[PDB]
Ligand binder design. Structure first.
Ligand SMILES: [Zn+2]
Ligand SMILES: [Zn+2]
Ligand SMILES: [Zn+2]
Length: 99
C-alpha cells in the first residue's frame, strides 16, 4: 500500500491504518457495513442505511460488500482528489477522521 498510494506520507497511511484497525471491531482485516455504521456513529456523523451502502459501493472495487484496507485508502484517495460529493458520507468520514 505504500508503494501504490504515493500521494500520502508514511505518517498519513499509518494514521489510516490506525483508524482502520480502530473500527474493524471483529479484527478480520475488513470493515463491513455494520462496522462502518458504528464508525460513523462514533465519529458523530451517523448515516442512513442506504448511505452506508453507497459509501461501501463507491470504493468496493472487489464487490465483496466489505471494505479492505486498500478500499479504505481509496476513500482518502478519492477525497483528496476532490472526487467525492460534500454531503456524502465518504467525504464526511474523511473530514471527520484526523488526517
Ligand atoms: Zn471487520
Ligand atoms: Zn440494505
Ligand atoms: Zn471490498
Amino acid at each position: 500500500p505504500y508503494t501504490e498510494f504515493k500521494e500520502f506520507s508514511r505518517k498519513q497511511i499509518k494514521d489510516m491504518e490506525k483508524m482502520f484497525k480502530q473500527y474493524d471491531a471483529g479484527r478480520d482485516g475488513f470493515i463491513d457495513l455494520m462496522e462502518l455504521k458504528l464508525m460513523m456513529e462514533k465519529l458523530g456523523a451517523p448515516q442512513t442505511h442506504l448511505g452506508l451502502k453507497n459509501m461501501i459501493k463507491e470504493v468496493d472495487e472487489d464487490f465483496d460488500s466489505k471494505l479492505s484496507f486498500r478500499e479504505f485508502l481509496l476513500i482518502f484517495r478519492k477525497a483528496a482528489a476532490g472526487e467525492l460529493q460534500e454531503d456524502s458520507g465518504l467525504c464526511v468520514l474523511a473530514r471527520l477522521s484526523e488526517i
